[PDB]
C-alpha cells in the first residue's frame, strides 16, 4: 500500500513475525524523470499485527491508514502517519458489526471516501451508519420487490462486483456470466434501480470459468473495462460509453509464457 503520502504504493511483505519490509519505489538514477525502481526495504517499530482483522485501510478518511483492531472483544485501531508515526491505540466508541460472514461486505454506496459495511443480497437491504469512521445505528430497508435482486457468492462460472462499469464513480453492482451482464442503478440510501444489461461480450460458455477475468477500467473514463485470459492471449473488452463493449483486443502473452491458475494478473501505474 501507499502509506507515505506517496500517491503510489510501497511493497511491504509483512506477516505475524512480520518483516515490515517496506520495499518502495525510488527514482532510477539517470534517465528521464519518469525512471523508477523499487529500492531497499525498511522494517519499523509497529503494532501487534496479528489476530485483529489487522488490515490496510484508512477508514476514517484521514489520509492516514488506520491499522484495524477487531479481535475477540478488542476493537479500535492505530493510525499511521506518512512519517510512520503509529499513533497510540485508538478506542473511539467504535461500533463494529458481527461480520457474521465476511461475504457480501458492502463498502461504497454509503458515499465516496466514507465507505461502510452492509451484508446484503435479495429482497432486503441492511444499512450503513459510518460517519468519518464513527457510526449511528444501522437499519433495515429494501428496494421495491419488482427490482431484480443482486446476489453474492455463487461460483457457478460467474463473477460479481461492486464496480462502476458506468464510470459515474458509484461502483454499481454488476453480475457477470459468460453470456450476460447486468448492472443496478445506484439508489444509495437503501436502494438500487432495476438493472440494465450491457452488451458486446460472450465466451464459449461450456469452456468458461469464473475468473480468468479482470476488471480494471483502462480507457480512463471510469467505465470499468474487462480482460479475459486465453491459452496464449488476453481478450480485452472496452466499454462503449458506459453502455456496451467494443470488439475485444487480442494480446499475445510474452513468448513461451502461458497464463494459468498459478499466474496472477494485476494493474498498477509503474
Amino acid at each position: 500500500i501507499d502509506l507515505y503520502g506517496e500517491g503510489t504504493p510501497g511493497i511491504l511483505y509483512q506477516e505475524t513475525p512480520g518483516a515490515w519490509w517496506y520495499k518502495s519505489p525510488q527514482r532510477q538514477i539517470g534517465g528521464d524523470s519518469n525512471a523508477v525502481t523499487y529500492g531497499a526495504m525498511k522494517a519499523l517499530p509497529k503494532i501487534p499485527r496479528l489476530q485483529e482483522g489487522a488490515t490496510l485501510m484508512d477508514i476514517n478518511g484521514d489520509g492516514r491508514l488506520d491499522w484495524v483492531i477487531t479481535s475477540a472483544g478488542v476493537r479500535g485501531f492505530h493510525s499511521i502517519h506518512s512519517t510512520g508515526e503509529w499513533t497510540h491505540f485508538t478506542p473511539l466508541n467504535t461500533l463494529p458489526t458481527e461480520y457474521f460472514h465476511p461475504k457480501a461486505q458492502l463498502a461504497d454506496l454509503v458515499g465516496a471516501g466514507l465507505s461502510d459495511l452492509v451484508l446484503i443480497g435479495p429482497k432486503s437491504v441492511r444499512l450503513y451508519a459510518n460517519q468519518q469512521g464513527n457510526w449511528a445505528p444501522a437499519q433495515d430497508v429494501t428496494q421495491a420487490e419488482n427490482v431484480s435482486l443482486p446476489v453474492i457468492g455463487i461460483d457457478s462460472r460467474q463473477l460479481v462486483a461492486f464496480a462502476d462499469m458506468l464510470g459515474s464513480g458509484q461502483q454499481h453492482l454488476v453480475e457477470i456470466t459468460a453470456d450476460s451482464v447486468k448492472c443496478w442503478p445506484n439508489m444509495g440510501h437503501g436502494r438500487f434501480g432495476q438493472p440494465l444489461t450491457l452488451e458486446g461480450f460472450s465466451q464459449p460458455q461450456t469452456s468458461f470459468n469464473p475468473d480468468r477475468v479482470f476488471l480494471a477500467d483502462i480507457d480512463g473514463s471510469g467505465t470499468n473495462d474487462i480482460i479475459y485470459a486465453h491459452s496464449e492471449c488476453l481478450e480485452i473488452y472496452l466499454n462503449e460509453s458506459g453502455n456496451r463493449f467494443s470488439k475485444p483486443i487480442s494480446l499475445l502473452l510474452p513468448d513461451g509464457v502461458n497464463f494459468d491458475n498459478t499466474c496472477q494478473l494485476q494493474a498498477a501505474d509503474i
Partner: peptide, 28 residues
C-alpha cells in the same frame, strides 16, 4: 515412472510443465 492422463476431450492443449513435491528421509 510411467505417467498418464485420460482423454475426456478436455482442454489438454492448454497445459504446461508439472511441479513435484518430494519427501524423503536420511540417517546422519
Amino acid at each position: 515412472w510411467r505417467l498418464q492422463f485420460t482423454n475426456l476431450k478436455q482442454n489438454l492443449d492448454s497445459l504446461n510443465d508439472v511441479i513435484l513435491h518430494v519427501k524423503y528421509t536420511a540417517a546422519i
